[PDB]
Amino acid sequence: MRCIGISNRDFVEGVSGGSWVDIVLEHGSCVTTMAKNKPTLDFELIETEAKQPATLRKYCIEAKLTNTTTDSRCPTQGEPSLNEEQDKRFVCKHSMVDRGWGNGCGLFGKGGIVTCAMFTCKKNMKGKVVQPENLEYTIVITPHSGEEHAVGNDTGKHGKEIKITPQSSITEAELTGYGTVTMECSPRTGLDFNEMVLLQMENKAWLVHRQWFLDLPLPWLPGADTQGSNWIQKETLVTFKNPHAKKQDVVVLGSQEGAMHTALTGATEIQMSSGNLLFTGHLKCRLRMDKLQLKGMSYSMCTGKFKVVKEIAETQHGTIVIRVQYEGDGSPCKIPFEIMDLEKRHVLGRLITVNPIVTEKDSPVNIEAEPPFGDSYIIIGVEPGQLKLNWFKKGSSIGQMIETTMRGAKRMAILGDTAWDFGSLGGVFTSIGKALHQVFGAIYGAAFSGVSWIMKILIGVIITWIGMNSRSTSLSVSLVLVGVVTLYLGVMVQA
Amino acid sequence: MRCIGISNRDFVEGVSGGSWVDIVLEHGSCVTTMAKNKPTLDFELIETEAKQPATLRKYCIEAKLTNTTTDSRCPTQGEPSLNEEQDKRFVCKHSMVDRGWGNGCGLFGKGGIVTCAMFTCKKNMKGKVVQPENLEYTIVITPHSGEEHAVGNDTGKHGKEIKITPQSSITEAELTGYGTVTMECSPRTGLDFNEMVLLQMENKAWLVHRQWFLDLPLPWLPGADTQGSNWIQKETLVTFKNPHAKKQDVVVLGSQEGAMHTALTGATEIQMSSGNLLFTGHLKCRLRMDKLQLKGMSYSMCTGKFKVVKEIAETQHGTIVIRVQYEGDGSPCKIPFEIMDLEKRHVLGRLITVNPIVTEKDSPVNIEAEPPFGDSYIIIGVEPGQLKLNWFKKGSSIGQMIETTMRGAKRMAILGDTAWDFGSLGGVFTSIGKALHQVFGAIYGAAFSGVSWIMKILIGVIITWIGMNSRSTSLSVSLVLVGVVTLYLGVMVQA
Amino acid sequence: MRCIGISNRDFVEGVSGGSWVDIVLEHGSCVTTMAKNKPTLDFELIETEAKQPATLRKYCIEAKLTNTTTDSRCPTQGEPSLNEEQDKRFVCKHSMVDRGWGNGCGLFGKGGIVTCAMFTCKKNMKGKVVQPENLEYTIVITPHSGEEHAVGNDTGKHGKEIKITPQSSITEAELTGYGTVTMECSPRTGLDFNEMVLLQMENKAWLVHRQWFLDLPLPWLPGADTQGSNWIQKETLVTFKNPHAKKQDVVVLGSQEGAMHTALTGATEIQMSSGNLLFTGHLKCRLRMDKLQLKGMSYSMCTGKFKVVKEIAETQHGTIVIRVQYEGDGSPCKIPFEIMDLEKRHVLGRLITVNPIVTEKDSPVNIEAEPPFGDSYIIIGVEPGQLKLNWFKKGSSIGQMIETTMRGAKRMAILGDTAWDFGSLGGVFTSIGKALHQVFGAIYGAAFSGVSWIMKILIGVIITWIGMNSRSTSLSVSLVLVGVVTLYLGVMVQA
Amino acid sequence: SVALVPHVGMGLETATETWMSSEGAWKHAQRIETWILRHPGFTIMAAILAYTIGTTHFQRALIFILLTAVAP
Amino acid sequence: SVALVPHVGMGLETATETWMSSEGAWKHAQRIETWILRHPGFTIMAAILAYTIGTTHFQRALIFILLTAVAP
Amino acid sequence: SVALVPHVGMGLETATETWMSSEGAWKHAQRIETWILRHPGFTIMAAILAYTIGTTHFQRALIFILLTAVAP
Ligand SMILES: *[C@@H]1O[C@H](CO)[C@@H](O[C@@H]2O[C@H](CO)[C@@H](O)[C@H](O)[C@H]2NC(C)=O)[C@H](O)[C@H]1NC(C)=O
Ligand SMILES: *[C@@H]1O[C@H](CO)[C@@H](O[C@@H]2O[C@H](CO)[C@@H](O)[C@H](O)[C@H]2NC(C)=O)[C@H](O)[C@H]1NC(C)=O
Ligand SMILES: *[C@@H]1O[C@H](CO)[C@@H](O[C@@H]2O[C@H](CO)[C@@H](O)[C@H](O)[C@H]2NC(C)=O)[C@H](O)[C@H]1NC(C)=O
Ligand SMILES: *[C@@H]1O[C@H](CO)[C@@H](O)[C@H](O)[C@H]1NC(C)=O
Ligand SMILES: *[C@@H]1O[C@H](CO)[C@@H](O)[C@H](O)[C@H]1NC(C)=O
Ligand SMILES: *[C@@H]1O[C@H](CO)[C@@H](O)[C@H](O)[C@H]1NC(C)=O
């Protein structure tokens, strides 16, 4: 369940090389996999915790100045200096002013003057990092089989919750009758911290490309402040104005929090003060099957009074899924059920729940079915054939190939290399393909990284054109290079 | 007298125009000048008291370190820090070190590490700017008036020393029996001050140019003083030793003293101790006659008998001097001096002290004369002849013709165009000639300073080569531009 | 231990030529290395303590001048001279001043006047020296893997400390159980002493070479002066000056401590408070592997129960080094170690701590291996699987390969010539190479010395171009010269 | 500052929207308009220098749009 | 002086940082260059005669850059 | 350090004698020579780069002198 009506999703028919599935999940998604035997499963990856973070650096959004002063000497004769300048906890500047004669000096012409200001930070913000070893994930997989817990329940026992930390590797999935999943996460090459900079603001935080968070302007600390205030800089903020030439003074300015956010814009949202748990995983792994029997198995096929409890709407695709009602045989009673085609048998089913199974005799329970393209009959087929429903999709197999083409592609650019992890067990094609993409990706289409939206599509064109009208053969490759790739990115980038 | 046997020395002939003569004064030198009538005078510079200047800068030669604390921070985990980095009066430094499970870390690779040493000194540079508000020159002048007192007697009231502060002007020199000689002296064009940097150094001193001064490394202070201990550029001393990897500690970086000295090598030394007597330089002044007297006109002619204590010298071109204990009557008057070709008369040589006058009975005075080339016949007396003296002066024709040529050139070398201010007066060809070589020179054989024998004279030899094989005319001016010009100026600069 | 987290150090797999392996050990570097057997070895040349040196140049840097007696004469007759011009310890120079009725004596003209002073010193260097008989190298080689007693902390016993030395050479070291390691080092031709001079300053000290340290300036002195003060120079230092014309006196050039500190810059340091401990200095050594059992090659393969007790971490390239704790029964059991691939044991576990053997159980051992360029799985269990975690390198082999080359230069230089001696008997290659590189290397490793960082590079520039033009493509001989030579050498030395 | 060099080009794009997916990203061009309308002139100048500079037509067009966007 | 031609080139270049090295190794060129712009006059002229003497692409180049250094 | 800056250039001058006189006046070059003696290799080297480099006879001479000099 909780794998119906989510959009971020995909079906994985197969198990290859025996219990050998390859899957990737992007925090906000449901991963569904089918297999001739074993109740296909639903994988929801949620809370991805982290503990023991390094607060390296510490900028401040607000600033303030105190006990400011300033002085001069007289043209040339000395480059004026003030005592308190000693405590580098201030901020100062040497400037020139035509401090002449009557001014109260000596030999007019032009002189020096410095202003001092005891600095004071106000409402810093600070970042923080994490040792991969401490990225406590939470993956929760579960089996269907109707239930009141229906589709989408934020409570009950649902395939349990296997909290996984690379501080280990292979974990068991104890499932009531349903078996025991063997999951092997790849908590390391997933998101990729210690490359990331977990920073906050104030009850709102952000994950950020390291090499940036360690260069974006502002007056900083060190991640050892522990009573210091020797903000390397103090200069990025607070500025000195020299109106005309005299009363050369200093000033504080405004608490960047504003622009901060408004520059942190292109960056992903996150967590922090809620215990801290930076969402948005992009984690992959192997779903090891082997043990995953189909429960309730050893039971007849209980016949009798059947009813329905809802109609039949669908998102994902043919995700038509209907609940029923029952009275006939208490205890785990398998429920007859099919996917026939308009009267004339020659069924064409896509039953997606490895046989339902009634139970509580009072519990309505439901079912998950992927009917065909056009017309179709799902049939409860019980006693006198009791009930047959005809629904009707629209799933023209071709419109299918297309929306699929894209859909995958979308998941292509968003996972890069890793994307190929949906292709559980390759060899030659899918395997080498993953390979080629690896390098072809990391470089070139990722050798000019840092590029930007506009520019992106812009180069998409300028480049296609240096292509379009070229000179024999080669251009084909030039264009492609343009095609989708840059292009499709430019229109399908900016997360 | 004074300018007598004192090397250097310049003899000038001028009353011209009807009132003045353009003359210079180079301390260790002296210009004896006169012309028609007047007690012919000996001018000499001597002492330049610069008063109550200011202290621009203040470096240090003796630098020591203390408290030296240091701390680090494991790989990544932020740039390492320590409070003490607050007290500006400390040298801090961030560095990297290979860290392992050994030093109790976590990652290894290389963490950060920092050092902190309070900074202090002994024996400071302490430059100084003077300000021509008071750059008082001291001038000593005087007549010859024989007198067995002597001719070098730097004691007593032999000419009386005098003051000259641009604070005011016109120096009206009172001078016994003569009157009052007047001088216009421009202390405001000599040592292009407040362009210079009078420097001190523990007890040593040196007139050192501004910019050179304001570039010399070493740590430096304000010129404000009181609390010093806030020297910048401490990076001239105290060094951070990072042997191979692990560990990194500091070192004072030795004293500086003598280094400093020899670092100099160009500045002209100077006694700056006793309220500083700033020797060296060249005061230029216009000299106006009149209101003078020789105390001889209206002073009889004195008759016969002359003892002659000592012989006859010459030195700077036959400027012979002689001492004669006159006898005859009393109450001194004139003494008839003469010089003609052996036997046959023709007063062939120029006398140089148109006042050979006796003072009192006993005081074997002295007169100075310039017997010409040849073995001129000197004589002194009246009727019974009383005296003749064979005196043979070598070369003296073309030999001295060129000799003085050089003398003069060198004058031009040191003190540039300002030297035409030694000719006499307005002249025309002169005055403007000066205003020509003036900028001309200011912009070629000079307008490219920062060299030496080697580099400079070498530049010559080459400007020559090229200046020797280029078709047409131009070449020529280029050739002399070099040789004797680029060159001579060269071989002489640096004395 | 001793070689985990020390960076920049090299390793050698396999010995060859029957225990006959070639090693070059430094101070910063260390050698990890092992054969197809024998417990791996950490090789660090540590204390290189010298014992008996002598003095041959007791240089001065702060001498005061006293007494000062100056005599004079008169033009021609006798070039002045005071006896003191013979009490060696006094300095003196023949000068000339003016000399006329004015000096108050002579008979006009410029002439003789010479002066002298007592040259007593203070600060003094002490350039000791040592024959290749008085320099003991202590080598710390340690038996990899074992206990959680840190893969570091120099302190405490871990691998012994053999004391090889030119007194003898080629020695053995008793390494508990495993065996007796026996190296055949050869101080003989490493350091290249006697060309070196141990110069102590105010306490610091630099081993700078003789063939210059002798040609250095200042006041000379032999070796055991003491009550000698028969200083051979002084002239260098102190200068009694005479300006513009007359008179003069003696002055000191000033303490040069500093300057010199800033002098020998560019010649390695060396502590100097307890006898001596002259660091740095590559030492060439033979390595005998014979008597060396890997210890416990006769055991069982644990049972299972390995709760790790330390993350893992990838260190200074390669050295991934885990720490595991095993509770159980077995006792003294070999660790079941495998660095495999994703499941399908294609296993490629280059563990490099051969036969890592659990000692007395209750003791968290640890080991170090070199996982591939991508992501490999790691495991150490057995019975019910026990343990397996996940891993990922970063760069990609080829990257490392280039870095193999980085060494290539940062090795084929520095420890030049001997650079070759880094490999274990390869005959043909290594052999002829050295025989050549020692030669052609000697040329531009002879004539082209003492030249500054920059300057060398320039030679590069002008050369690479002068080659470039080419008359019968021999220029390649030229470029190859520039290439990774003139350039590299230059662009990488001085430090 | 907190004005420029945001978090664009980095490369941590995810499955969920970031901090200002549509809004800001579109706003950029939104403002080039703001400006480019505000002060025609530079448009003028640009396309002109454009016209004579380059001449490959596509050339012109290119530095025209280009130049225009560069001018804050 | 102990302030001129000091155990710099020689050799014995130990694979472990030296002394005032580094900081200095660069400070030097930095020193002159500064001077250079302190007196462009000399540069200007030199530059010229260089432009003249010998000359041949990089040729002229060399004479110059070299002299430039030459002067302190 | 302090060491590399001969106050000459400015040339405040005098008819007198500056601090360091002939001593430095010649040392400069003499020391250069001492050094030459030290690495005669490099002289042969420099002259080489010369004799071979460009040549107008002068050229050669010129650059030769320089290099040999320049070596700090
Ligand atoms: C979410 O799951 C919970 C778990 O059962 C469902 O809550 C039950 O709702 C029924 C009907 O109101 C109550 O009688 C039970 O007592 C509830 N169980 C408890 C204790 O939570 C809930 O219906 C589900 N919500 C949906 C529709 O997702
Ligand atoms: C310098 O001039 C002074 C006059 O002020 C001379 O001093 C007198 O010299 C005479 C004869 O030598 C003595 O009899 C007197 O006793 C001295 N009186 C004074 C002024 O002290 C002095 O001899 C001259 N010597 C020089 C330096 O030329
Ligand atoms: C360096 O070696 C020493 C042993 O020579 C280790 O220190 C020991 O630590 C244990 C732990 O409690 C003590 O019981 C021993 O008494 C210590 N030995 C002493 C006195 O030095 C040390 O741990 C090693 N380095 C590291 C960081 O492990
Ligand atoms: C700074 O100035 C404030 C005035 O608002 C004063 O209260 C405070 O004592 C001063 N702090 C010092 C000691 O500089
Ligand atoms: C510095 O160290 C000294 C001891 O050398 C100590 O007396 C002093 O309190 C410390 N604090 C300072 C002045 O840095
Ligand atoms: C010379 O020197 C000594 C000591 O340096 C000092 O007492 C005096 O000036 C002279 N000695 C004697 C009296 O000969």
Q: Do F14 and B218 touch (CB under 8 A)?
A: no
Ligand 2 centroid vs B149 CA: distance in angstroms?
Answer: 7
Task: Please count the CA atoms within 13 angstroms of the CA of D7 that sit on its side-chain side.
Answer: 27
- Domain boundary among the residues A264, A294, A324 is at A294
Nearest of B91, B93, B89 to residue B72 by alpha carbon: B93
B interface test, pick of A56, A72, A82, A199 with most B CB neighbours within 10 Å: A56
Q: Do A267 and D18 touch (CB under 8 A)?
A: yes
Q: Do F1 and C239 touch (CB under 8 A)?
A: no
Q: Which chain C residues touch B103 with a CB distance below 8 Å?
A: 152
Q: Which ligand is nearest to the CA of B87?
A: 5
> Does C280 share its domain with C176?
yes
What 8-state DSSP symbol labels residue A268? P
Residue D69: domain span: 1-72
A interface test, pick of D4, D12, D31 with most A CB neighbours within 10 Å: D12
Nearest of B228, B246, B250 to residue B237 by alpha carbon: B250
Kindly state the tokens that stand for B476: 């020529």
Q: Do B78 and A85 touch (CB under 8 A)?
A: no
Q: Where are the beta strands (DSSP E) in A30-177?
A: 30-34, 41-48, 53-54, 60-72, 92-97, 111-124, 129-130, 137-143, 162-164, 170-175
A150 with A322: CB under 8 angstroms? no
Phi, psi of C259 (to 5 degrees): -25, -60
Q: Do D1 and A218 touch (CB under 8 A)?
A: yes
| CA of A151, closest atom in ligand 1 | 28
- Residue B393 three-state SS: strand
CA of B467 to nearest chain F CA: how many angstroms apart?
13
CATH for D49: 1.10.8.970
Ligand 2 centroid vs B42 CA: distance in angstroms?
Answer: 20
Nearest Cα residue in chain F from B281 = F14
List subunits contacting chain A, requiring 3 or more Cβ pairs under 8 Å: B, C, D
- Residue C120 three-state SS: strand
Q: Residue A467 is which amino acid? A: G
C interface test, pick of E4, E7, E60 with most C CB neighbours within 10 Å: E7
Q: Is B68 in the pocket of ligand 5 (CB under 6 A)?
A: no
Query: Which residue in this structure is represented by tokens 């000599």?
Result: B190
Question: Hey, whose CA ends up nearest to atom 11 of ligand 4?
Answer: A67
Cα torsion B449, B453, B459, B460: sign: positive
> Does A79 share its domain with A45?
no
What 8-state DSSP symbol labels residue A85? G
Cα of first residue to Cα of last residue in chain C, in angstroms, is 29
> Does C285 share its domain with C326?
no
Of the residues C154, C155, C309, C323, which should be mutated to test ligand 3's pocket, given the most ligand atoms within 8 Å of the CB? Answer: C155
Q: Do B455 and E3 touch (CB under 8 A)?
A: no
Q: Which chain C residues touch E3 with a CB distance below 8 Å?
A: 256, 259-260, 262-263
Q: Is B118 in the pocket of ligand 5 (CB under 6 A)?
A: yes
Please enumerate in sequence order all residues whose Cβ is within 8 A of that of D4, keeping only pairs 6 or more positions apart, or say none.
Answer: A263
Q: Residue A31 is which amino acid? A: V
Please enumerate in sequence order all residues whose Cβ is within 8 A of that of A359, keeping only pairs 6 or more positions apart, or say none.
Answer: A296, A331, A332, A333, A365
Q: From residue F69, how far is each of C330, C463, E31, E59 by CA, in Å?
A: 77, 18, 18, 19
Asked if A447 is an interface residue toward chain D (Cβ–Cβ < 8 A), one would say no
Q: Which ligand is nearest to the CA of A84?
A: 4
Q: Do A216 and D5 touch (CB under 8 A)?
A: yes
Burial A69-78 (b: 16+ CB within 10 A, else e): bbebbbbbbb
- Describe the crossing of helices F40-52 and F58-70 by its angle, rounded to 10 degrees: 150
Nearest of A109, F5, E31 to residue B208 by alpha carbon: F5
> Does B400 share its domain with B485?
yes
Residue B56: domain span: 52-61+124-130+194-229+255-273
CATH for B469: 1.20.1280.260
Nearest of A495, A458, A484, A326 to residue A405 by alpha carbon: A484
Which residues make beta-bridge pairs with C12? C33
How many Cβ pairs within 8 Å bridge chains B and E?
A: 48
Number of structural domains found in chain F:
1
How far apart CA C400 and CA C395 sit, in angstroms, is 7
Nearest of C201, C194, C187 to residue C129 by alpha carbon: C194
Q: Strands across the sheet with A20-25, in order?
A: A20-25, A283-288, A179-185, A170-175
Q: Which ligand is nearest to the CA of B1?
A: 2
Resolution in A: 3.6
C interface test, pick of A21, A133, A195 with most C CB neighbours within 10 Å: A133
Please give the helix or strand (H or E) that residue C389 lies within, else none. Answer: strand C388-390
User: DSSP labels for B195-208?
Assistant: SEEEEEEBTEEEEE
Query: Which residue in this structure is represented by tokens 């860290």?
Result: B99
User: DSSP labels for A271-306?
Assistant: --SSS-------EEEEEE-S----SSTT-----SEE
Q: Which chain E residues touch B465 with a CB distance below 8 Å?
A: 53
Please give the helix or strand (H or E) that residue B12 lies within, else none. Answer: strand B10-13
How far apart CA C368 and CA A438 sit, in angstroms, is 29
Quickly count: other Cβ atoms within 10 Å of residue A46's Cβ: 16
CA of C313 to nearest chain A CA: how many angstroms apart?
10
Q: Do C152 and B100 touch (CB under 8 A)?
A: yes
B353 with B147: CB under 8 angstroms? no
How far apart CA B182 and CA B202 sit, in angstroms, is 41
3-state secondary structure chain C: CCCCCCCCCEEEECCCCCCEEEEEECCCCCEEEECCCCCCEEEEEEEEEECCCEECCCCECCCEEEEEEEEECCCCCCCCCCHHHHCCCEEEEEEEECCCCCCCCCCCCCEEEEEEEEEECCCECCCEECCCCCEEEEEEEEECCCCCCCCCCCCCCCCCCECCCCCCCCEEEEECCCEEEEEEECHHHCCCCCCEEEEECCCCEEEEEHHHHCCCCCCECCCCCCCCCCCECCCCCCEEECCCCCCCEEECCCCCHHHHHCCCCCCCCCCCCCCCCCCCCCEEEEEECCCECCCCCCCCCCCCCEEEEECCCECCCCCEEEEEEECCCCCCCECCCEEECCCCCCCCCCECCCCCECCCCCCCCEEEECCCCCCCEEECCCCCCCCEEECCCCCCCHHHHHHHHHHHHHHHCCCCCCCHHHCCCCCHHHHHHHHHHCHHHHHCCCCCCCCCHHHHHHHHHHHHHHHHCCCCCCHHHHHHHHHHHHHHHHHHCCC
Q: Do B263 and F10 touch (CB under 8 A)?
A: no
User: Between vectors from CA B204 to CA B155 and to CA C258, what angle results, nearest 5°?
Assistant: 160
Q: Do B223 and A82 touch (CB under 8 A)?
A: no
Nearest Cα residue in chain C from A190 = C392
F and E adjacent (3 or more CB pairs under 8 angstroms): yes
How far apart CA E44 and CA E58 sit, in angstroms, is 18
Q: Which chain C residues touch A188 with a CB distance below 8 Å?
A: 375, 390-392
CATH for A317: 2.60.40.350
> Does B269 share its domain with B337?
no
> Does A314 share its domain with A448?
no
C105 with C72: CB under 8 angstroms? no
Please enumerate in sequence order all residues whose Cβ is within 8 A of that of D31, keeping only pairs 6 or more positions apart, or say none.
Answer: none
> Does B366 share its domain with B303?
yes
Number of structural domains found in chain A:
5
Cα torsion B148, B151, B152, B155: sign: positive
Q: Residue C170 is which amino acid? A: I
CATH for B205: 3.30.67.10
Cβ-nearest to E16 among C28, C206, C452: C28
> Does C282 share its domain with C187?
yes
Q: How was this structure determined?
A: cryo-EM
> Does C79 share its domain with C114?
yes
CA of A281 to nearest chain C CA: how many angstroms apart?
18
Q: Do F8 and B218 touch (CB under 8 A)?
A: no
How far apart CA C352 and CA C3 sit, in angstroms, is 12
How many Cβ pairs within 8 Å bridge chains A and B?
A: 82
Nearest of A420, A400, A425 to residue A14 by alpha carbon: A425
A210 with A201: CB under 8 angstroms? no
Please enumerate in sequence order all residues whose Cβ is within 8 A of that of C303, keeping only pairs 6 or more positions apart, or say none.
Answer: C328, C329, C330, C333, C382, C383
> Does B24 share its domain with B165?
yes
> Does C442 share its domain with C326?
no
> Does A36 share its domain with A57?
no
Asked if C449 is an interface residue toward chain E (Cβ–Cβ < 8 A), one would say yes
